[PDB]
Amino acid sequence: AMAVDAERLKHLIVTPSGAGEQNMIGMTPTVIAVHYLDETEQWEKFGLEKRQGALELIKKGYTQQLAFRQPSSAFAAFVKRAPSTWLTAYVVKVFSLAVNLIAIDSQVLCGAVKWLILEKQKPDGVFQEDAPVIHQEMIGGLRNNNEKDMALTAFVLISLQEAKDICEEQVNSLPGSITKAGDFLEANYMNLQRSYTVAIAGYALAQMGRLKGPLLNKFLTTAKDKNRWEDPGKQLYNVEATSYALLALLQLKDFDFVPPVVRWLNEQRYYGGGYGSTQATFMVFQALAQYQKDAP
């Protein structure tokens, strides 16, 4: 397929400002904007002088987010507020994708990973949130989900895998935690009912090579008309879920299921931005960029 016109992505250049959560909301679209334009290579029809004008904004959001880094290398909205399991895992997720953009201090990234594993992982692999984020609209379809330990564990695990190579040396309990998280997902994947959880956990399993057999059939047949993973309401959740599926399909090298999924995503005409658009904006452009990188 053809890459998205960069002229429709101008509104994603957002100046980051706010608390430990407010800053990441504004940081997210900027980071994923240049990441997409890097792969698709549209800096010529958009102006290379603007690249540095956005690259330094990412640096700004990074340094401003460091002020909310707690002594346990965890992250919360406030320096006094109890650290969030999701927010910390989201900081790792965004920073891992921006390691080739700006200078990301490895001690910050690995410290957060070590905290998630040591203090926030149940012995059965489950990651638990003990201090939810204030802005509940920045967590996408994880908001008001019946399922559960599964959805959160899948989310955190995806972050750990995106930072596995860069923090394998410092944190040795990382491959063990990854396996444990994957064991819980695989053991309860067939019992999933919501398409969102099927999509996000399916991607987590696919990154391991543990999305096979009945788990795969469950994943593929959950797709409405073989082109999207749809839950009744909140379109933004369905875009986010389909993006996770696309990433899972690209991991499986399944180029029979990729084109109709990509085709559907492009016919939604979603370019991110707005209230509660953080996850969808981050997902729909991480997936489409991965598609551009992998498409023959």
Binding site: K226, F255, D256, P259, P260, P296
Partner: protein, 179 residues
Amino acid sequence: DSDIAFLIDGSGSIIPHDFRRMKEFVSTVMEQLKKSKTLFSLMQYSEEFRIHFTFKEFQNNPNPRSLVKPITQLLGRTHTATGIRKVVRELFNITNGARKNAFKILVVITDGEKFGDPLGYEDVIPEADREGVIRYVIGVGDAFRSEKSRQELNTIASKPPRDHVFQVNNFEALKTIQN
């Protein structure tokens, strides 16, 4: 004095544009070749299988553009081998309209990329030879782009492969095989 079957790819790797080409190519072959008493049958495949018209159902309805118009795409994976086995065992059965002592022709229209198929080509080809099934292959999209794709088209087609493998957009695909 010839039975012609169509095995068309309906997997998601086939873009809707290339599927129209498939859907229009068949209409041309059926119209520019009647030319009775040639019989036609068509089955679309993906990860599932659907017979749109048998040799009997075509003998009752002569209009070519009518039998192919409501045909849609399956959008599954790509099970080429299983599709070939299903054609020779079912579509070429007398109970479906296959006539005795008539030429069996299979027209496989695929992009040359089988995927997710439990069956291999080495499990359906030696069976297609002992039944005497003429195999023509019509590559679509980027079926001639790669090396594994072009050798797959030659694998499906019989020998020699230089007389069986053609590109879909060719309007001279029928005038070259009649002689």
